[PDB]
Amino acid sequence: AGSIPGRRS
Amino acid sequence: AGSIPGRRS
Amino acid sequence: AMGSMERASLIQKAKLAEQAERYEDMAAFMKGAVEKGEELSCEERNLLSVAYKNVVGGQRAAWRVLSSIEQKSNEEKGPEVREYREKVETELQGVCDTVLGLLDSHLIKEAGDAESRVFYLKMKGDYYRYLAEVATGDDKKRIIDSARSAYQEAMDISKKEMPPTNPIRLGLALNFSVFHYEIANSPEEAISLAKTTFDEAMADLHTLSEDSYKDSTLIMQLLRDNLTLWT
Amino acid sequence: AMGSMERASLIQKAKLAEQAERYEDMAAFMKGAVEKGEELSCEERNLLSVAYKNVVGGQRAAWRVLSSIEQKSNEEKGPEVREYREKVETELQGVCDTVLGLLDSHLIKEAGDAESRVFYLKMKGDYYRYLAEVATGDDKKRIIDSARSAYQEAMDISKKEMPPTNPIRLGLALNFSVFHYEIANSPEEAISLAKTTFDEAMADLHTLSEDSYKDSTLIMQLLRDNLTLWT
Ligand SMILES: *Cc1ccc(S(=O)(=O)N2c3ccccc3CC[C@H]2C)cc1
Ligand SMILES: *Cc1ccc(S(=O)(=O)N2c3ccccc3CC[C@H]2C)cc1
Ligand SMILES: [Ca+2]
Ligand SMILES: [Ca+2]
Ligand SMILES: [Ca+2]
Ligand SMILES: [Ca+2]
Ligand SMILES: [Ca+2]
Ligand SMILES: [Ca+2]
Ligand SMILES: [Cl-]
Ligand SMILES: [Cl-]
Ligand SMILES: [Cl-]
Ligand SMILES: [Cl-]
Numbered sequence: 001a002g003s004i005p006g007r008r009s
Numbered sequence: 010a011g012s013i014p015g016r017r018s
Numbered sequence: 019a020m021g022s023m024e025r026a027s028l029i030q031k032a033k034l035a036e037q038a039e040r041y042e043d044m045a046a047f048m049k050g051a052v053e054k055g056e057e058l059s060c061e062e063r064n065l066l067s068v069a070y071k072n073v074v075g076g077q078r079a080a081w082r083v084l085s086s087i088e089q090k091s092n093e094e095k096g097p098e099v100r101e102y103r104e105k106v107e108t109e110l111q112g113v114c115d116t117v118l119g120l121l122d123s124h125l126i127k128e129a130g131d132a133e134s135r136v137f138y139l140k141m142k143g144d145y146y147r148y149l150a151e152v153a154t155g156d157d158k159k160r161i162i163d164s165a166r167s168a169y170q171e172a173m174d175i176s177k178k179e180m181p182p183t184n185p186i187r188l189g190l191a192l193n194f195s196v197f198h199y200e201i202a203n204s205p206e207e208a209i210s211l212a213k214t215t216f217d218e219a220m221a222d223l224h225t226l227s228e229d230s231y232k233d234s235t236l237i238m239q240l241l242r243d244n245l246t247l248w249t
Numbered sequence: 250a251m252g253s254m255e256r257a258s259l260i261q262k263a264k265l266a267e268q269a270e271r272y273e274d275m276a277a278f279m280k281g282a283v284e285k286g287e288e289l290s291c292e293e294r295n296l297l298s299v300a301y302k303n304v305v306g307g308q309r310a311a312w313r314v315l316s317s318i319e320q321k322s323n324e325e326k327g328p329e330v331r332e333y334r335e336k337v338e339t340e341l342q343g344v345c346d347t348v349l350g351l352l353d354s355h356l357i358k359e360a361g362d363a364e365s366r367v368f369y370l371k372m373k374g375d376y377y378r379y380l381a382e383v384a385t386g387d388d389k390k391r392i393i394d395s396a397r398s399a400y401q402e403a404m405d406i407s408k409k410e411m412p413p414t415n416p417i418r419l420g421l422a423l424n425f426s427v428f429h430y431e432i433a434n435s436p437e438e439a440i441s442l443a444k445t446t447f448d449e450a451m452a453d454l455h456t457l458s459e460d461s462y463k464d465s466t467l468i469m470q471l472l473r474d475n476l477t478l479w480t
Contacts, residue, residue, distance in 0.1 A: 001195075001196050001199055001200060001244040001247055001248065002192075002196075002240055002243060002244060003144070003192060003193045003196050004189035004192050004193055004237070004240070005071075006064075006067055006068035006071045006072060007068060008233070008236060010426075010427050010430055010431060010475040010478055010479065011423075011427075011471055011474060011475060012375070012423060012424045012427050013420035013423050013424055013468070013471070014302075015295075015298055015299035015302045015303060016299060017464070017467060027327070027329050030326075030327070030329045031329055031332075031333050034315060034318065034329070034330060034333050035333070037314055037318070038310075038311035038314040038315055038337070039307075039310070039311065039314075040311050040337070043336075076270075079269075079270070080269035080270065080271050083268055083269040083270075084265060084269055087265065087268070095261075096258070096261070098258050098261045098262055098265070099265060101262075102262050102265050102266070105274075106269070106271070
């Protein structure tokens, strides 16, 4: 599962 | 221009 | 170490370091900026988070590669794989301890606005979560509880003070859901949290401008991606 | 720094570091291995080269990003872009100096077989070339000449001792051609070298096994890619 990225990309 | 890579890939 | 450099110069160099993909430098510049003792703006909080998230993200990926090799070895390869995994693990723990130390001295205590306080408590939850991913000793339960407690305080503030589409509230819910699934052995809680978050955000999208909509829907899709993986 | 670790353990950990994409660690392990004072095998020479090529390659890419920003700035941004470019440049120079120091103490002088000696002299040419990419002072000409001289000695040995399809001979020619084009302002020499290398390798492919053919043709295609870019 993915967590929030540091930037939108 | 490209130089030799460290590995074949 | 950055004590002699101006705050504004540290911020400027953190931005340059990000452009150059020099994330260790970026983190050192932002640590220096925090240590000036002044609160951080929204943009500056994002520089701090980007820098450390990229540093620890690389350590986590390397730890996972090494831990997979070590588990497979368990022909006798000697102590080297375990020693090197331990080295990377100690480094990772050191970075997490550094981030937690910045949050405790004194970012969280001076953060009064909901946006700043939630952001920092989410970070606190995340770096305890990264410590929990590698923990195996007598303190594992306490590390998991420390992550839980930070995320819970952030959640309680976010639900009182931010709309359900706020990107910080959404990212917090995303990360806390990952905590439930991957750390706390609570997949049902993880799924519940992601679905209720997604549905409550959906119902508030009508209030948003085009650019705010784009931001909220991007994080909603991350929630949906995890729900698809988990169900 | 690695003085207390066994040679074999340093080699093993360099391999693990490569798998984990921890190239700074890899380079430190290989520096420790070289400093044990024993010659390196073919495989070990490749670990040394991979480690430092990846470290310096990242520094070069960051230096280029920063140098582009600095040239565009030349509104007054203050000294920070130049200072940070200088910081990265000093780091890069330090790594190149370290590699050159390993080659001079004492890898090259003990390398008697053509394969080892050519490999190390090619590396020497490469790290002087990386120093030349950032050089602007009184020693720029001497740095360029040092790269030239190392590559030339490697070329002279390779043409006497290796077949025209040998991958080390081919990679040396590739890199020396890049030197001519990008450093020495000699694009015609670069093109000539790449085309004669390619054509002489083509004419020797008939002697090779399937696996040797694959290796030689891979480097031939790199030569051809540069020729297409340059013509
Ligand atoms: C935890 C958190 C941190 C920062 C943000 S954000 O809104 O600043 N933002 C963002 C906006 C929209 C979609 C994803 C993101 C993550 C990167 C940052 C720049 C949100 C949540
Ligand atoms: C400069 C140089 C160094 C190493 C080699 S190689 O033959 O060991 N090899 C290779 C084989 C075939 C095609 C490309 C390469 C570059 C990576 C290494 C592993 C050749 C030239
Ligand atoms: Ca000041
Ligand atoms: Ca066996
Ligand atoms: Ca405050
Ligand atoms: Ca020994
Ligand atoms: Ca102006
Ligand atoms: Ca010898
Ligand atoms: Cl962004
Ligand atoms: Cl390979
Ligand atoms: Cl180690
Ligand atoms: Cl600097």
